[PDB]
Structure formats: C-alpha cells, structure tokens
Amino acid sequence: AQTVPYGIPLIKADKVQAQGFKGANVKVAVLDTGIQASHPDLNVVGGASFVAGEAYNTDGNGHGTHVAGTVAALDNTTGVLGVAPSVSLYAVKVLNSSGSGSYSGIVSGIEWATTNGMDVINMSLGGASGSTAMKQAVDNAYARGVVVVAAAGNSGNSGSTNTIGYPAKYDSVIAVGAVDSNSNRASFSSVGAELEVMAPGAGVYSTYPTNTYATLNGTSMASPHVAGAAALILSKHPNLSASQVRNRLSSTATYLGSSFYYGKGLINVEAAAQ
C-alpha cells in the first residue's frame, strides 16, 4: 500500500529514519505554487500567500505539492514516503498557477519564513537574474540561522559556461543539481562553480494535486531531498547551526566526478546525520 520512491534509499534517509529521526519539531517552509492541503498523504500546518487571488492551501499547478511530497509525505499505509515525514510543513505561495512569481512575492516569502521561525527554506524555483533585495533576504535568513536550499537550474551545460540560476547562485544558498536512480547526473542539471550537492531529480514519484501521485523530473525535485535531509539532521542534533548542517551535507557527500558538473557529490544523510 505505501510506496518508497527510489530517492529515499539512495540518500539513505531510510537509515536515519530507522534510528527514529524523522524531522519531528523541525519547521520547513516550501516556497512554491502552494500545496493541495487536503491531500491525504500530507499535513500542512500553515503558511501564507504572496500571490493575488490564490490562498496558500490550494495548488492549481501540481509543482508545489510534488515538492512538499518529497520533504514530508506522511509515514502511513498509503501513498508515498517523504525524507522527513514528521516535519512541520508550511506552504508559502510565491509562484502563481502557471509557475511564475515576482521577485517581490519571492522576497516576501523569504521574509515571512525568517520571521515565523522556519528552520529550513526550500526554493524549487530559479531566475537568470538576482536582485539586491533577494540577496539580502537570503543572506539575512542564513545569518539568522535558516538553512536555505534552492534548485540549481535546468539549463544543462555548454562548454565552460556557468548555468546556475538565482537564488542558488548566492553563496548563502545551497544549489542542488540532479541525479537519477543510477546516481548518474541528469542532462538537465545546471553546471557551474556554485554547484554544491546532488540529490535525486529524475523520475521522482510524489504527491500531486487531487489526491494522487505523479512522476516529475527536475532540479526542483532534487532540492526538497536536501531540505528534508537538513530536517533529519536537526531532529538528531538540534544544537547544530545552519552552517554546521550545511558542512555535514557537503563534507560527507559521495564523490561522483568534477565539482563543475556534480559539486561535492551525492548527499548521504546517514554519514551527514553523524
């Protein structure tokens, strides 16, 4: 009855879980298209919306629901399993139904998360340009003790071209690139100097609008795996800081090749978790 996406085992999230660490008491904010809060495999505890005319608890685009799924689909007898199923989930709608949003809605969501005490911020979501405001929000949030994770981008590689997007490019933010179930880098992952870690991003099965499950591809799918991994670590060592959580993830990642295409490699929550 319950399915275990290949992604959880690959990052060895299952092993931290077996020890009894599942992100209990860790507050994760998912900055996306919202979340079908009525899905039976999810438990959204709150949030807000920065998008005109849409609450935060409806998702007219499946995207935000799928990502919310990778972090926290409940541990039960139905649907899927999230990396940190006992997390406190907040849906912050910063993107519209068609998948786009303004810097201003985006910076609003960041600020709401910092302010409301969120421990992790997932932004599956990129842009070719940053702003001064954005950099400020992210830096500040990070400085204020929040672990900020973002999708690196789906721009592939072209020679020695850096293709990493905003906000992943900011050094206070963890840029996540994508691998498949054979730990091979996916073609769509952005490349560049700022790439930090890899997570499963190809053929990820998760929660999808109207009480169902679907498979999606993208760096967007990769990022929540890392947000989840952060929450696992924190439930084990609640004393750790954002930079300490960050160093654990990158310094214990499985080496896959050149940093340009892979960062420090594929995350290993068991080694990271200590």
Query: Which is nearest to 228 in space by CA: 65, 127, 119, 134?
Result: 119
170 is known to lie in a ligand binding site: yes
208 is known to lie in a ligand binding site: no
Question: Which of 39, 63, 66, 225 is the catalytic position?
Answer: 63
Active site residue 63: yes
CB of 45 to Ca ion, least distance (A): 17
Active site residue 124: no
Q: What is 21-62 written as a DSSP string?
A: -S-TT-EEEEEES---TT-TT--EEEEEE-STT--SS--SSS
State which residue, 76 or 104, has the beta carbon closest to Ca ion: 76
Active site residue 237: no
Three-state SS sequence of 246-258: HHHHHCCCECCCC
Query: Which is nearest to 154 in space by CA: 220, 243, 58, 66?
Result: 220
202 is known to lie in a ligand binding site: no
36 is known to lie in a ligand binding site: no
User: Can you give the binding site for Ca ion, defined by CB under 5 A?
Assistant: 41, 73-74, 76, 79
113 is known to lie in a ligand binding site: no
Question: Which of 172, 220, 223, 235 is the catalytic position?
Answer: 220
Biggest CA pair distance of the chain: 48
Residue number closest to Ca ion, CB atom: 79
Q: How many angstroms separate the CA atoms of 29 and 97, rounded?
A: 18
CB of 85 to Ca ion, least distance (A): 7
CB of 22 to Ca ion, least distance (A): 12
- List, in sequence order, the alpha helices (H) in 87-155: 103-115, 132-143
Helix, strand, coil percent content, the chain, rounded in steps of 5: 30, 20, 55
State which residue, 1 or 52, has the beta carbon closest to Ca ion: 1
Please give the annotated binding residues, written as ranges. Answer: 2, 41, 74, 76, 78, 80, 168, 170, 173
Q: Which residues does the annotation mark as catalytic?
A: 32, 63, 220
Residues in the annotated binding site for Ca(2+) = 2, 41, 74, 76, 78, 80, 168, 170, 173
